[PDB]
């Protein structure tokens, strides 16, 4: 194993495949077919990157540690010719006047996931991908007891792919397009597959191409491929949970409302975050109290002609929802102070947020 | 707080 | 009280002034026409001066402090915030925006006592800036030697002088300020240099310094900043300051070739070898896991060859710390300090001591 | 490590 690179064709791989276990730490590097191919783990998801090898080089392979020699790569001056060879049971990398002689583990050692069946592929930009996990991930439990919950929902469905993300207390759906008819599928990718299926998007011009297995997700970008183990389990079905008939309808501005429930917050318990909202005529007043008898007050002129009503809820919520949306009109869909709001971009139904009220 | 379920 | 004051106004000042209940509070109190805002931990105090154009009423209470400045900062751009006292509660007023918050009365509020100031001197702003930046890095951390914990602020003739040592590296900054001194030394806590820093924002307004035998104020515009002194005799560091070896390099190529083998150096330990000879330097690290790198550089040297071990974290931190492109090492033998300077400046100089 | 003072 041999092979002269410049560095700027190993920066983009490097940072992108980089423990429980010593070899879990280190990058299996193989030459082959006039190609070098890097490879990190987890046990649990495998990143490779697969590099092509203009310059001499001959074939084998070996793992080295990955920081190092990452940081090694990155730490050499621009335009620099790197240089990698094996002399026993260390690797050597030269360029310029710098050598660095590494401890290797055996590549045989490595290890290697087993082979799994595709059941849906699709093809879709990673604008769309981005999207998806951006409108959703807020919404993941936080190491909660039901492990299903702390994963994100991708489901397939006629022509559009969707993400699902619940805590059992508040929910985000987002649907989007995809312009190729899709099989009927749901599978539940852990919180780290999601961290890295948004770490591996840079916006450009190349698309995304997924695979789903029975206990498998595959992500291809360029010369990357991204795998992970999906969540064994059985996710809540959202369509039971979307407000029925609602007969309560409010607009108002994004910023004002986001400007205003973030002000009551301040005043609000610190554990339990009640906010009360009062709703009439054209008009929303929310209130605040801790027990320290602080309180605050916020009143707004919004879009609302039904009932007057008193509901409760958890300011952390309603923020992220706000937070989560980019646009500058709000609806929310209410029925009655016991059950459920729907929030949402006025101009746009691609993304719903679920969030159950509070009782004070 | 109530639940979604 | 009662004051009522543009959001913007506000901003800074609340910025600038933020265990026992009271501490977690600010000190409002409006008087001739101004409002001051007072901050607290014991050590040290922040006070700021707000001028009151709009009707106001005097008087004066505590409020909490994150509390209060989350509440004016949540406000919208160019607000105007009308605040009352009504009963044991303060009430903040802005737009159709409404809060109440809990009270401490202001006589319970800890007030330090008065002291004399022995020393005072004025300077611009970017010398201060630059005394703090160029010795902070070498303070040591949580070190049971006190006293090597802060900072060294000394006098001499027309000078001013910052110190930092952890008892393994120095770093000594000298500035001239034309005002003639007497001699006096004292020793600035961690945390009263992070503020010192702190209160610069890097404008026109002077910085005006009063020190005392256990006080340091400091002036600039219309805040005042307090710190305690740290009661210890900080070590001779002139007894450390030495030199027949000197090495001139450029200073990113050196900063460079020392961050490379610093990777495969010992995490704990960071110790890296020098070999210096006619024109070059060899710089190698080694670890447990016996990985090796090594380094070679064209340098301008021409006294004898010579083999010595250093901390690459000590080495480093001096070289980020000199924004300059050439570099001055001082050398005697492998058993004695570095001298590390600019070669184009004598303002600042580092001493590193040697690893075996 | 040494070793100043």
Same mark, same amino acid.
């Given at each position: 194993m041999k092979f002269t690179v410049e560095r700027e064709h190993l920066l983009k791989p490097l940072q992108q495949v980089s423990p429980t276990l010593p070899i879990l730490g280190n990058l299996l590097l193989q030459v082959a077919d006039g190609t070098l191919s890097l490879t990190g783990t987890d046990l649990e998801m495998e990143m490779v990157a697969r590099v092509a090898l203009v310059q001499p080089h001959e074939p084998g392979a070996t793992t080295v540690p990955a920081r190092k020699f990452f940081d090694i790569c990155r730490g050499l001056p621009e335009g620099a010719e790197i240089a990698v060879q094996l002399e026993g049971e260390r690797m050597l990398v030269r360029s310029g006047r710098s050598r660095f002689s590494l401890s290797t583990l055996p590549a045989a050692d490595f290890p290697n996931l087993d082979d799994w069946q595709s059941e849906v592929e699709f093809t879709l930009p990673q604008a769309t991908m981005k999207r998806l996990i951006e409108a959703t991930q807020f919404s993941m439990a936080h190491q909660?007891?039901?492990?299903?919950?702390?994963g994100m929902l991708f489901e397939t469905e006629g022509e559009e792919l969707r993400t699902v993300a619940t805590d059992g207390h508040r929910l985000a759906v987002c649907s989007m397009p995809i312009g190729q008819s899709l099989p009927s599928h749901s599978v539940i990718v852990p919180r780290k597959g999601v961290i890295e299926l948004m770490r591996?998007?840079?916006?450009?011009?190349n698309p995304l191409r997924v695979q789903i297995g029975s206990n498998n997700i595959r992500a291809h970008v360029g010369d990357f491929i991204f795998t992970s183990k999906l969540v064994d389990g059985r996710f809540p079905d959202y369509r039971r949970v979307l407000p029925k008939n609602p007969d309560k309808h409010l607009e108002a501005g994004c910023d004002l409302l986001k400007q205003a429930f973030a002000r009551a917050a301040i005043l %609000?318990?610190?554990?339990?975050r009640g906010v009360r909202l009062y709703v009439s005529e054209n008009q929303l007043k929310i209130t605040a109290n801790n027990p320290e008898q602080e309180e605050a007050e916020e009143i707004l002129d919004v879009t609302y002609s039904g009932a007057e009503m008193e509901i409760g809820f958890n300011v952390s919520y309603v923020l992220d929802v706000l937070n989560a949306l980019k646009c500058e009109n709000v609806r929310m869909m209410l029925t009655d102070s016991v059950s459920s709001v729907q929030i949402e971009d006025?101009?746009?139904? %691609?993304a719903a947020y679920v969030v159950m009220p509070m009782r004070l | 707080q109530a639940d979604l379920f």
């Open positions: 909660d007891v039901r492990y299903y919950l702390n591996m998007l840079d916006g450009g011009d %609000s318990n610190e554990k339990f006025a101009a746009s139904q %691609s | -």
